[PDB]
Write a protein that binds this ligand. Structure first.
Ligand SMILES: O=C(CCC(=O)N1CCC[C@H]1C(=O)O)[C@@H]1CCCN1
Ligand SMILES: COc1ccc(Cc2ccccc2)cc1
Length: 608
């Protein structure tokens, strides 16, 4: 009903229908300049003004029907930005529309953008720009109702230096030389499917593409295009599986974009162009589960969207569920349970890090006066998945629940819903099983902190080997280390190898002699898998092995994935032999880190 993260007019007052973006990317000044034409529809009678979200934006003028109108910026409200009130030249009746062209310019401190210098890229000769609007950063790029309760289509014309390429979360609609400047190109984009504004994405740089499917192009710098094309070859197979689970894919194109290492997330479900971290380039497709996850957002998240960020679990919860069904269809049901059981372990970590009582461990959170970037964690992913997984086992198994999910996506397609909307449809769909649903502790699952009230049933086939080897190392004495050998891993996949470290890491610290012996027989230092290397180094740093200090500092700074960089920095700061280096390394790299990551890493290290 009320979006406590937005200062703009609610959807009950007016709602944006379309956005026409005409801007120019200036790497000299690190700014976006142009006009944002918002087609606004009134939701009440005698509407004479509205408020929009902005964050560090410069408003030159606001034109309506070819005339300038009066506008005013309120005082800034911290992360929410500054509200922008506009005086309409006419009063609108209900359902009447008007087009508001706003001339704007971004600040180099835009929390949605990161500007890279040539030395920060692979080619080393051209700059790079990419955007991250989710959750409420789009207001830092252009004025808008920065709330997932409004969905709009958009067309865009972006001007960039001719030697560079621009891509957006839309269907490419041609390129032509800038008629005003021979040194620039203009790339045209159109997104015919209405989306919440947080799915607005832009990227500019020396980008090349490689076709890996009938509807998928992999984009990155020349140095990673081929490496990326192989890593994500399963994309089309996952799109077909996703189509079988959630219905037709309605976005036309599904391209991939591998960004520089400073990308904060593993992936971003930007429509038509998923952004992914280069840390997925393991060389064996072992991390392609993130691709399945991002593909699933084409239904759960982008089609059926959370009305507010309090109900973020709807987006991620069902997305993880779809993702793990896609991997199950590709590698077997036992693999689905293996990952499901592993996700429960991550949920254990998040609750133990926040605390059994922390409000952020609730499935549905109250973000009033809370920066979404500060509450973001695995809770909505795993606790949300555990609920759906719990409901699957409670209502008749995966076949039955997938039927509900497909009907759920068709029921709320192109719309924004709340948790109660989802709960109601669950009761409507399973009307013949309300007696089973009433046995569910909806208050504990949806609004209670800590671990869920009940744990689902997990198959242990693929996990036992991990627990076996993990228990050996934890209980091992000094005269037992000699019996460990590289042969211990001959039948363990990369995922089992990663889960073994996760289980072992839960009982850290280990004796310093155990860690040294582990590297001697297992040689984990030589593994480039970011997931495995991340946990191996955490085990080392937490076990007080000084040799691992430079390794952890290098991984924590040579890439910017918050999943890895934040825990690495925290672990290094808690190690007395590396505390000073950790704070120093952050301070020297702070200026060139991603704006969101730099803020969170500063708070984690208590240097803010
Ligand atoms: O479902 C996704 C991305 C998944 C993503 O990368 N996640 C989610 C938890 C950990 C983290 C990561 O892999 O770095 C998006 C991403 C951020 C908000 N929405
Ligand atoms: C990564 O982008 C997001 C998306 C959503 C949120 C808000 C939130 C966080 C944690 C739990 C519930 C809701 C923050 C950041």
């Amino acid at each position: 009903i009320v979006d406590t993260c937005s200062l703009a007019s609610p959807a009950s007052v007016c709602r944006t229908k379309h956005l026409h973006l005409r801007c120019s990317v200036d790497f000299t000044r690190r700014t976006l300049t142009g006009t944002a034409a918002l087609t606004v529809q009134s939701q009440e009678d005698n509407l004479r003004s509205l408020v929009l979200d902005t964050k560090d934006l410069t408003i030159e003028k606001v034109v309506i029907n070819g005339q300038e109108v009066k506008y005013a910026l309120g005082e800034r409200q911290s992360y929410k930005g500054s509200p922008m009130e506009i005086s309409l030249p006419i009063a609108l009746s209900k359902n009447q529309e008007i087009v508001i062209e706003i001339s704007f310019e971004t600040s180099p401190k835009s929390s949605a953008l990161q500007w890279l210098t040539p030395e920060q890229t692979s080619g080393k000769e051209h700059p790079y720009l990419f955007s991250q609007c989710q959750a409420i950063h789009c207001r830092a790029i252009l004025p808008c109702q920065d709330t997932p309760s409004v969905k709009l289509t958009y067309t865009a014309e972006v001007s960039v230096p001719k030697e560079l390429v621009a891509l957006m979360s839309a269907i490419r609609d041609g390129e032509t030389p800038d008629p005003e400047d021979p040194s620039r190109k203009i790339y045209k984009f159109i997104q015919k499917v209405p989306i919440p504004c947080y799915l607005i994405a832009l990227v500019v740089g020396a980008l090349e593409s490689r076709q890996i499917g009938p509807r998928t192009l992999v984009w990155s710098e020349k140095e990673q295009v081929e490496k990326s094309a192989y890593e994500f070859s399963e994309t089309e197979s996952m799109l077909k599986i996703a189509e079988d689970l959630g219905g037709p894919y309605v976005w036309g194109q599904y391209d991939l974009l591998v960004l520089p290492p400073s990308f904060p997330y593993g992936g971003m479900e930007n429509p038509c162009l998923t952004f992914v971290t280069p840390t997925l380039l393991a060389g064996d497709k072992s991390l392609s589960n993130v691709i399945a996850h991002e593909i699933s957002h084409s239904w759960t998240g982008n089609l059926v969207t959370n009305k507010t960020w309090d109900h973020f679990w709807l987006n991620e919860g069902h997305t993880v569920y779809l993702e793990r069904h896609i991997c199950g269809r590709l590698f077997g049901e036992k693999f689905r349970h293996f990952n499901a059981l592993g996700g429960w372990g991550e949920l254990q970590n998040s609750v133990k890090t926040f605390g059994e009582t922390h409000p952020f461990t609730k499935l549905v959170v109250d973000l009033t006066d809370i920066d979404p970037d500060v509450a973001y964690s695995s809770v909505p992913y795993e606790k949300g998945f555990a609920l759906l997984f719990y409901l699957e086992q409670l209502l008749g198994g995966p076949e039955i629940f997938l039927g509900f999910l497909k009907a759920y996506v068709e029921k709320f397609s192109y719309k924004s819903i709340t948790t109660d909307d989802w709960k109601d449809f669950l009761y409507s769909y399973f009307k013949d099983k309300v007696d089973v649903l009433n046995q569910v502790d909806w208050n504990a699952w949806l609004y209670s902190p800590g671990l869920p009230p009940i744990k689902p049933n997990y198959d242990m086939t693929l996990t036992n080997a991990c627990i076996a080897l993990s228990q050996r190392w934890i209980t091992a004495k000094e005269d037992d280390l000699n019996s460990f050998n590289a042969t211990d891993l001959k039948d363990l996949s990369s995922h089992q190898l990663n889960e073994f470290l996760a289980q072992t890491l839960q009982r850290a610290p280990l004796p310093l002699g155990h860690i040294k012996r582990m590297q001697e027989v297992y040689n984990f230092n030589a593994i480039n898998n970011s997931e495995i290397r991340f946990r191996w180094l955490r085990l080392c740093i937490q076990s007080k092995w000084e040799d691992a200090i430079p390794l952890a500092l290098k991984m924590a700074t040579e890439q910017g994935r918050m999943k890895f960089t934040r825990p690495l920095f925290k672990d290094l700061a808690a190690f007395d032999k590396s505390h000073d280096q950790a704070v120093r390394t952050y301070q020297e790299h702070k200026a060139s880190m991603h704006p969101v990551t730099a803020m969170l890493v500063g708070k984690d290290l208590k240097v803010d």
